Amino acid sequence: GHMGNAAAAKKGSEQESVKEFLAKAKEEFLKKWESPTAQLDHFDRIKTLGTGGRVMLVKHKETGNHYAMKILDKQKVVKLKQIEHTLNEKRILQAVNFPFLVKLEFSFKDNSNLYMVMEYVPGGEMFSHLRRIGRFSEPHARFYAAQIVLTFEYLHSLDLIYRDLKPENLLIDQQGYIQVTDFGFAKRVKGRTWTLCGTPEYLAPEIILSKGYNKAVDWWALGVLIYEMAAGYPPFFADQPIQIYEKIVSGKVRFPSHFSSDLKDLLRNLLQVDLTKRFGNLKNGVNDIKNHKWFATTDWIAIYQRKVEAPFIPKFKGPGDTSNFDDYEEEEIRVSINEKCGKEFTEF
C-alpha cells in the first residue's frame, strides 16, 4: 500500500485518538451550552478595528487589558432578520473552546445595542497581509489551511456549521497562528439547513441554488480559501455577485500555472459540485483532507499544540497597538433612554 506497517498503525492510532479528543470536547461543549458579563462604562473606547456590526478596540478600566468589542444595533438586527443569527453567535462563542477560535470574554446589552467583548488579536486580518504580499507560497498557505481543517473538524463534530470562512475573518495572533472570528452565521445543524447566507465568492453551489445544504459548504469554502491564499485571488472572481454566482455554479475552475499538481488535486476535490464526491462529505470524512498528499508534511498534532514555527510573525509594538489594522470612520455609540427590542433579545 501507500503506507508500510509502522506508518499505517501510527496513523490509525492517531485517528482513534482524534475520536477520543472529539468525544471529550463534545462533553465539555454540551456542559457549557447548558450552564453558560459587564457593562459599557467599564471600558474606554480606543479605535474601530472593523465594520460591517462594528468592532472597536477597548480598554478595560480596572485591569487595563485590551479587548475587541463588537457592537450591534438591536434595531438593525431586527430589520435584517438576524435576531436568531445574533443569538447563535453569542451562545456558540460562549460554549466553544479551541486554540484557533477567538475567545468571548464578556457580553451584555443596553437600550440600543448588543455587545460581545472578545480577545484582541493584534496581528491584523489575514486579508490585509494577503493583499499586501500578493499571494502566499504553498507552505505558508498550508500552515494556515491546516489550522482551518482542525477548526472545522472540531466545529463539525459538535454539529456546528461556520458559514463565513474568508481571509477577512481570520486574524493573525502574536505567534503567527490563526484566530477565527465572526460567528454570526454559525449554527447548530445536525443535517440540513436552508438560510441563504455567506459571502458571494465563498458560497458553495448548493447555497446559490437554494438547496437544503449541510456542513460540506464549509469544505467548499476551504477550497476557495486555499485557492485565494495560494493565487492571491479567489477561483470565482467577478465585479458583481450575480456574475460570481454564475461562475460558481458552472464550477469550471482554472488554476495558476505555479500551482503544484498536489494543490490542484486537493482543490478539485474540495471545489467539487457533486456532493457525493466532495472531500469532507465522504465516508472517510475529514481524513480525506488530512491524509491528502498536499498535507503530507503537516504534523497535525504539532499544529494543534502551536509548536510549528509560523511563516510570519506580526510586528507587535505593544499592548493596545493597532498598527496592523486599517483606519475607519469613527461614529458615536449613542444609547437611547428608551429600551428597544426588549422582547426579541431577552435571551441575549
Partner: peptide, 13 residues
C-alpha cells in the same frame, strides 16, 4: 476583473 476590497456578507439572494 473582480472584487479586491473587503467583501461584505449577504443575508439573502
Amino acid at each position: 476583473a473582480g472584487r479586491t476590497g473587503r467583501r461584505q456578507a449577504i443575508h439573502d439572494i
